[PDB]
């Protein structure tokens, strides 16, 4: 079977170098170039360029020229997209394929996510958050947490060991000073609490911070 | 009285900015960005390779 696997999410900062690995199966390695597409941070998908495999010949894409490479390596057939002089911009979704030359490809590469920031590893600031009285409307209270500041991802929010998933909604992350913030809520009726507890359990293994925070009366 | 301008001739020249793209075997043409504008000199050729 052909299933193109990636190095996966990779953590880099301004400066440095990267070789992103893509390893392939199903098929024999020097007989598909690898086509090579950057999915922008705008989740626009930028074509970086195509390596000739046999001959080992990489075909950039002008915009992507001279601080990026395509290397390969035959005998375990894994593909290597090098990167130089990492820059904030480049954070980003890259993507391998197996080609079928001008209709491309029939198999899509798992994917690598690379993040070039400047921060310290830290454990998120979870925080339980107490609804007002303009904050219970329809007989639900509404309750919350905070996740503030962490790096890097992922966390794993839930309420009660994931107990309780109905009004759950674990909203993303974005950037403050190369730190993530996101918040989740969960939704239970107004007569399960204060009355039965509802702890937020955010799990930070890049961290290795598991935090429990129960929303307590005003 | 009057001399029109016929034309005029560069005898003197000097290099500036070489720039040559390399390209793998079984290519076929090799083609550098520089060949749209007029004043960069741009020829054909090839490399030995390894």
């Known amino acids: 079977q052909v299933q193109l696997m990636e190095s996966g999410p990779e953590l880099k900062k301004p400066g440095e170098t990267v070789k992103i690995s893509c390893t392939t199966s199903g098929y024999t390695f020097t007989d598909y170039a690898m086509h090579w597409v950057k999915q922008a941070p705008g989740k626009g998908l930028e074509w970086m360029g195509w390596?000739?495999?046999?001959?080992?010949?990489?075909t950039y894409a002008y915009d992507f020229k001279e601080r990026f490479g395509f290397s390969l390596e035959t005998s375990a057939s894994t593909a290597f997209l090098q990167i130089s002089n990492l820059k904030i911009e480049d954070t980003a979704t890259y993507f391998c394929?197996?080609?079928?030359?001008?209709?491309?490809?029939?198999?899509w590469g798992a994917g690598t996510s690379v993040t070039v920031s400047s921060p310290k590893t830290t454990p998120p600031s979870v925080y339980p958050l107490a609804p007002v009285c303009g904050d219970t409307t329809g007989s639900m209270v509404t309750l919350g947490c905070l996740v503030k500041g962490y790096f890097p991802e992922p966390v794993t929010v839930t309420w009660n060991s994931g107990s309780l998933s109905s009004g759950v909604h674990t909203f993303p992350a974005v950037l403050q000073s190369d730190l993530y913030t996101l918040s989740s809520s969960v939704t239970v009726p107004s007569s399960t609490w204060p009355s039965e507890t509802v702890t937020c359990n955010v799990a930070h293994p890049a961290s290795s911070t598991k935090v429990d925070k129960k929303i307590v009366p005003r | 009285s009057q001399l029109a301008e016929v034309r005029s001739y560069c005898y003197h020249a000097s290099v500036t900015d070489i720039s040559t793209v390399a390209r793998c075997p079984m290519t076929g043409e090799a083609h550098n960005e520089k060949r749209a504008d007029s004043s960069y000199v741009c020829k054909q050729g090839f490399t030995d390779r390894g």
């Open positions: 390596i000739n495999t046999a001959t080992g010949e990489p």
């Open positions: 394929a197996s080609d079928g030359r001008y209709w491309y490809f029939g198999v």
